[PDB]
Paper text:
Here we have determined by cryo-electron microscopy (cryo-EM) structures of the head and tail components of [name], a phage infecting Salmonella Typhi. We investigated the structure of the recently characterised phage [name] as an example of flagellotropic χ-like phages and more generally phages with long, non-contractile tails. Cryo-EM analysis of [name] allowed structure determination of the head and tail components at resolutions of 3.8 Å and 3.5 Å, respectively, and the generation of de novo models for the major capsid ([name]_17), auxiliary protein ([name]_16) and tail-tube protein ([name]_22).
The 3.5 Å-resolution structure of the [name] tail reveals a robust but pliable assembly based on hexameric rings strung around a central spine of the tape measure protein. Our structure of the [name] tail reveals that the helical tube is built from hexameric rings of the three-domain tail-tube protein. The rings are stacked with an axial rise of 41.2 Å and a twist of 19.7° to form a right-handed helix. Clear density in the cryo-EM helical reconstruction allowed structure determination of the first two domains. Only weak density is present for the third, C-terminal domain, indicating that it does not strictly follow the helical symmetry of the tail tube. The main body of the tail tube is formed by domain 1, a sandwich composed of two four-stranded β-sheets with a long β-stranded loop extending strands β3 and β4 (β-hairpin). Assembly of the tail tube involves the formation of a continuous antiparallel β-barrel connecting the largest β-sheets of six subunits on the internal face of the tail tube. Unexpectedly, for such an elongated assembly subject to substantial shearing forces, there are relatively few inter-ring interactions. These interactions along the helical axis rely almost exclusively on the extended β-hairpin, which contributes 93% of the inter-ring contact area. The placement of negatively charged aspartate and glutamate residues in the assembled tail tube appears as a right-handed helical track through the tail tube.
Residue numbers in the entry:
A (entry chain C), C (entry chain A): 2 to 273
B (entry chain B): 56 to 109
D (entry chain F): 2 to 109
E (entry chain B), F (entry chain J): 219 to 273
G (entry chain J): 2 to 55
Write the structure that this text describes.
């Protein structure tokens, strides 16, 4: 016997991650998640045994371990554009928009009392932010309108719509709200518009569907225990659970992973 | 070599979806919840409408 | 943007129901349930999609809705003879009993300390209520007794039983309780009785097994919101859950339904 | 419309039971359980419908009720020799023992 | 979902094609206020535009 | 078979001569609802009109 | 290559039949069966080939 000294620990540490290039195993640089409120490591280990058939009832002659899937789940509270690329399995795209003038667009079916987004194209699919000079005219819905060139006040069947009591626009997002009580836009009426687009740098997170491989690392600085840090040479980050946007608590993103093996030499988990 | 060594893995599907509630109850949201359609009609002003309950 | 005004609502309203005649679709008149403490409408909607097999892994090319079963459950607190006909899947029977005299009945096996019901016939199967003049005699159980006519004090093997210390009768229900310590009725002893039946109108709820079709309607008068009322042209009322008779809370009857479709024109749900 | 009067109820009552003779349907006398603290009646009713196959997706053309099993559970607090015959599925036997002397027995 | 967050750097979501379906139950009478639980499932519009666009 | 398909571009079939024969069994009593399984075999009416016409 | 649009289908339809008079080929009027829960079309096609012997 002896007077023994245990190693109690409270876990506090940062979690790092570096993606691999697509279809290869080259690093790209470890990113910083943020404050991860939990970081668990679980193991599902099924076995396989053989009960002997020479004496006794169900005597275990030999057993062996089939698999031991090293994995775990974690959440994170820092929400930037970079972690949403991992949760939505997508990629950050830092683009701009072209400063164009006289951008013309048609809305053929119209119910009044409905929002409308200006400029849903293939270049900027989520919309156009920044509108300088807005003008629109109305027409009957049974007439097909060709706005291939020229102004819209000069085309046939056009009637200029007053800006008061008929619609309402904000210029920081380019959103048209047709009024629910607008006598000029009642009936079966279509609308052709024009607007001017500014130029600013904007960020999209285009959420495709591909599994993201990479290495995981938790450097820990424990406040009461002898600290130690973990390293996973290859995991596969997948989204887990739900991502509740609105509520009372603060928004967390629950992740999960599954530690694979990089090659025939380097193994799955390295505790330093 | 080995017992259950993961040589390669891949993602079959990733179903992006979600649920939400709403508290504003008008005639327009009930068309979405009941999978139906709003019908704004009238009734004909008729007189001497006769009906039997057997 | 705008200053928007929501439509908040607290639901309070009455629930109506009219049965159909058996094997047809004719109405009979909407009954009033009572205060229904809850009335829910749920929808189980399974879908069917087809993942594309030309590019990508599990890309949804097209999806469609197989079924959308409009249905719901509700409870009710008003317990009369009319709602028990719906919960027990039966039918209210408003009958009478025939005012007869000298009604004679035999009880061949007798354990003492047991209740006995007078007049379990095919006309009034639950019993006979209202007894005027009760007399009974005892005999040995090995002797078959024929009480086809005449009084019972004059038949063979008869011994008149004293009313004190041997049995006990209430006349409002016609129930015989043989005393647990009665020396006159100990052993293997049978009993033949006589009694007189009064005449009063009585109500039974004969609980058969048939599905009850009908239309459902909830006219609502909401105390804080813009009210609106529902109408189901054909549902099928079925009993749901349990009906706890004794306890602390007040007795509720949980129902359920499943909105069918009346014909090829009228659909399943009409919100006004 | 009207001023309606509901029928609210708190359930308190006694529960009676009379056995049948074995293999027959003859009564024997209703016994008294005691204070039964609960007495519920539940119904498990599965149905059978036929979705039409001429127009639409899963349009209920006709439905019908297969079974409606009327049943229930209850407890009881009075424990005598008579209710234990029902719970243990047995039978009360009121016997005696023979007054004998010099009863000899071995425990090996 | 255009969001105007009271404490964080706000951002808005866009789904090019979903399929709104009713979910859960719609309790009419009770104590709390009536809510309608919906659900959706983000499909893909064509071979170019993908399922989710965070701006 | 005139078809009115709920999700696809509908089309209808026409067989100028078949021979209806009973097939399988016709279970009278049971749990499911009684169905009658038929079968046929598309013959040819003459030397001009063929066996199957999809419109 | 292109952005192709398939033709997916769920089959729902009615099945009609008109008898012939006995020993002839004259029509008599198409009857309505009812809801037919399935309607399959199968083809048994045996072939005949000749393996070369040169």
């Amino acid at each position: 016997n002896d007077n023994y000294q245990n190693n109690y620990v409270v876990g506090r540490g940062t979690v790092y991650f570096d993606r691999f290039q697509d279809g290869t195993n080259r690093k790209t640089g470890e990113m910083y998640f943020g404050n991860t409120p939990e970081f668990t490591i679980n193991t599902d280990s099924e076995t396989l045994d053989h009960y002997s058939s020479d004496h006794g009832m169900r005597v275990m002659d030999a057993s062996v371990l089939l698999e031991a899937s090293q994995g775990g789940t974690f959440t994170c509270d820092n929400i930037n554009a970079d972690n949403l690329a991992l949760w939505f399995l997508g990629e950050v795209s830092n683009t701009t928009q072209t400063q164009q003038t006289d951008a013309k667009e048609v809305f053929n079916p119209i119910m009044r009392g409905r929002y409308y987004q200006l400029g849903t194209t293939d270049d900027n699919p989520t919309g156009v932010r920044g509108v300088t000079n807005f003008q629109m005219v109305k027409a009957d819905a049974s007439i097909a309108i060709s706005v291939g060139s020229g102004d819209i006040t000069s085309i046939v069947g056009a009637t200029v719509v007053n800006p008061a009591g008929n619609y309402e626009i904000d210029l920081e997002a380019g959103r048209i709200y047709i009024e629910p009580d607008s006598t000029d836009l009642s009936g079966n009426v279509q609308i052709a518009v024009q607007y001017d687009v500014d130029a600013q740098k904007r960020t999209l997170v285009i959420g495709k569907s591909n599994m993201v491989y990479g290495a995981l690392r938790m450097i820990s600085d424990n406040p009461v225990g002898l600290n130690k840090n973990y390293y996973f040479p290859k995991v596969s980050i997948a989204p887990d659970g739900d991502y509740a946007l609105k509520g009372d608590d603060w928004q967390v993103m629950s992740f999960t992973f599954k530690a694979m093996q990089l090659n025939n030499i380097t193994q799955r988990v390295y505790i330093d």
